[PDB]
Structures are given as structure tokens and as C-alpha cells.
């Protein structure tokens, strides 16, 4: 995290500070937080951010957790596009079966509660209402507090700000 | 087809791989419908690897005019998806103003409009613009395109998006 | 530099090329407003090449403060657009909670706020966040910015987005 920070431009000071703050979350535990940071990092599609965050994630997440986080980003990459599209068509295509395989959601290799949090986070970044609302409800049914879900949204947003800030200077170097 | 992308996919993305193999073999869309969709979608994900590989094999399924029309659908929707979505978020408060945006390709894509519209639809799903998605779906219906074909294009766009996300991650960690 | 971007555009993206020429010849917005919009938009597309070209020619139309403000607007909206979009999908069920996100640049961008807000509006259109787009537009109207100028900013955002898509495609296919 210390690397990304110094790498951020001066006009992105707000982002730099928010990043230092999110890494100190007290509402989310180690796996939840770093799993959200890793998934989000992947979802920004920024290679630099993913490399930096993923690196320090090795000291906070297990192999299974890591794969699940990246897998969450990948599977939502598909789901977020499909459901959002069907959503825009005002239920006119709900009678049809999506026929999309997504076993990872049922068996992520770790507690589904965490997988759901990471999927919620990626859905905010990609912008799919159907999915974000679906995963939010699921998290609330398993006992996750709104404050915890809210913290995931903040981390996703912050990582998104980081990726944008970095991609900029990187291209203008 | 495109075994390079499938083989490169990570183990934790098995679902994406299986969906890619399946979409490239459905009997809902014909060759031009399907590959035009895959090409346009690949460009829309902004992932170079996915586009480079699908583009390499697209030459065997699409004519030069089809390829250019697919790629052009992505470019033009890149602009339209931003403009019209913005306008929609403003609750028609700016609908009385003339956009003044040139978009001749839509009227003359160089190939059957039914396909250009299908590809524009797919890209609109990837960028996320309700106005455009709804408009193209309607045009597709007016030109007799099978409701399930439109649905298949949405699925294809979604799948290619997962492929792009899945491969983008590995490339950054390679 | 604009000529460089234009020449790079493929033939099937002629509409994009013409819109770019038109928007850059616009008299609606002045140099700072226009180039600030183009620069902030370029950064938001995530396309390095486009940002580099626009940023190169923007130097002759933007002060150091304006340039920093425009890039800063893209960065801050990158965070805000996601946060408020997600919160928005929850239909206010999370509107009671304190964001706790630092966004000092918004209150003190280093230049009069009206232009900074125009650029924030532009980026919000590109990322696609209803909440932020609506908010920034309202603010602009309350500070005396007319619809024609806000509309021009939306158009520029969309065009730059089309350019970035067209260019990303040829870059990956070359």
C-alpha cells in the first residue's frame, strides 16, 4: 500500500489519504477487507494497482481466498453485464433461461459470506443494480451488518479512484 | 475455436471458460451474427488480448466489410452510449437540444442492418446504456430478428466481458 | 496533436473523426473549459494514447492550475462515481450512513469552481453515475452555467469516449 500512495499524483491527495484510511478498517476483518481490496483492484482493470495490492494481499489472504477474490471479479464481469442488460429490457426477457454457468458462486472455496461481499463490491464498480441489490440482500440474510457492506462499497470506490489516478500519470510520464 | 483464450483462462474462472466454449457453438446465431458479436464485444471490453485473438480467427468467419462494421459498431456506440445515457440521467431535460453528433455508419454500415444493430446492441450492454440498448432491441424486432437471437447476443457480450476481466488479471500478475 | 489522433482513426470510424474536428472547433466553451473537458474526459477513458495526445495539445490551452484541476476531477470522480452509483442502487437505504470519504479538492480545486464542476460532470457521464451527473448539473445551473455549455461538455465527453474506443481497437490489432 505504501507504494501506491507515493505513486499517486499531488492533485489526487484525497485518494491517497482515503487509501491509507481504508487499510485500517475496523468493521471488516482481514479476509473481508483484503479480499474486497483484491477483487476491487482486479475490477478496475488497472494492472499497476492489481500488482501492488495483490502483492501485499499475499500476507493477509490464503491461496483459496485469493483465487476466490479474483474469481469473484471475473464471474461478476459477466453477470454484471448480463443482468444489467436484462434489467434495461423491463423484464421482457425474464421468461428465458440465462443458461450461464456460475458454479463458483455456490462453491467459491471459502465462506460464501465473504464471496458475496466481494461480488457486491465488484458490482458497484461495474455498475449493475440487479446484482448489487441481490448480493446486498444475501449478505444481510447471513448476518452481515449494513456498516460492513457499506465499508466494502467505500473500499471499492477508493480503489477505483486509485486506479484512475495512477493510469493518468502513468500515461503522462 | 479461440483455444488460446480458453487455455489461458485461470482455474478459478472455469465457469467463464465453459461459457466461452458453449457460446461459440450455439445454434441460435449464424456465423456472421455470432462472430460479429464476439468481435464487437471483444473491442468493447478494451482488453487487447481478447481482441487480438478473436480478431485473428474472425478473418475466417467474417468478410472485411463485416469486420469493419463490427469494429465500427463498437466505436460509434462508445460515443452514443455516453451521450444518450447522460441525457437519460437528466430526465429529458435536454431532449429538445439537437445532439449534432454525426453517426452515418448507423444508417449505412456496409452490411445488413440487422447484424449491425445486433452488434450495437451487444456493445450497448457492455458499456451499460439503457437508452441505446432499448432502442437497438426495438430496431432488431422491427427487422424480424429472433427474440432469442437478441438474448443470445446479450449472453455473448456478458461472456466476453468475463473473459476480458479474467485474462486482464492474469496478465497483470504474470 | 488533434490531427495525429484523427489520422490514427480507421476509415470505419469516420464519424468519430468528424465529431472530434467539430467539437475542437467549438466556440461554445472557451479554451480552458473545452480543453479541460477534453483532458478530463481523456483521462476517464483510461486510454493512455488518447490522454497523451490530448494532454500534449492541452498545454497550449490550459494553465498549470486548470490542468491539475481537470486531472484531479477525473481522479476524484473515479471514486465518487462508484460510491454514489452503488449507494444509488440501494434506493436510499444507505443514505443515512456517513461516507467518510475525503474530497477536499472539490471545495478547493485551485481554480474557480464552475469549470471544475463542468469537468466533474463530464467525467460522471463517461463513468455513468446518475447521482453525480445530476448533482453536478444542478450545481452548474445554480452558479450561472447555461444548458448549451453543459450540453457541449456532454458531447465532448461522448466524442472523446468514441475516440478512445476506436484507437484502443487499432492499437490492439496492430
Swiss-Prot record, chain A:
Any GO MF annotation of the entry: peroxiredoxin activity
SUPFAM superfamilies in UniProt: AhpD-like
Pfam family, one: CMD
Keywords: Antioxidant, Disulfide bond, Oxidoreductase, Peroxidase, Redox-active center
EC numbers, comma separated: 1.11.1.28
GO BP, sorted A to Z: cell redox homeostasis; response to oxidative stress
Disulfide bonds: 128-131
Oligomeric form and interacting partners: Homotrimer. Identified in a complex with AhpC, DlaT and Lpd.
Protein function: Antioxidant protein with alkyl hydroperoxidase activity. Required for the reduction of the AhpC active site cysteine residues and for the regeneration of the AhpC enzyme activity.
Protein name as catalogued: Alkyl hydroperoxide reductase AhpD
Gene name of this polypeptide: ahpD
Amino acid at each position: 500500500i505504501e507504494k501506491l500512495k507515493a505513486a499517486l499524483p499531488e492533485y489526487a491527495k484525497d485518494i491517497k489519504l482515503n487509501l491509507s484510511s481504508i487499510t485500517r478498517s475496523s468493521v471488516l476483518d482481514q479476509e473481508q477487507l483484503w479480499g474486497t481490496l483484491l477483487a476491487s483492484a482486479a475490477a478496475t482493470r488497472n494492472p499497476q494497482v492489481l500488482a501492488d495490492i495483490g502483492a501485499e494481499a499475499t500476507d493477509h489472504l490464503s491461496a483459496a481466498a485469493r483465487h476466490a477474490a479474483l474469481g469473484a471479479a471475473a464471474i461478476m464481469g459477466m453477470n454484471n453485464v448480463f443482468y444489467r442488460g436484462r434489467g434495461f429490457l423491463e423484464g421482457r426477457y425474464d421468461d428465458l433461461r440465462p443458461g450461464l454457468r456460475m458454479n463458483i458462486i455456490a462453491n467459491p472455496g471459502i465462506p460464501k459470506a465473504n464471496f458475496e461481499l466481494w461480488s457486491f463490491a465488484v458490482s458497484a464498480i461495474n455498475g449493475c443494480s440487479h446484482c448489487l441489490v441481490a448480493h446486498e440482500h444475501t449478505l444481510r440474510t447471513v448476518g452481515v451488518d449494513r456498516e460492513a457492506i457499506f465499508e466494502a462499497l467505500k473500499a471499492a470506490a477508493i480503489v477505483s479512484g486509485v486506479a484512475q489516478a495512477l493510469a493518468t500519470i502513468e500515461a503522462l510520464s
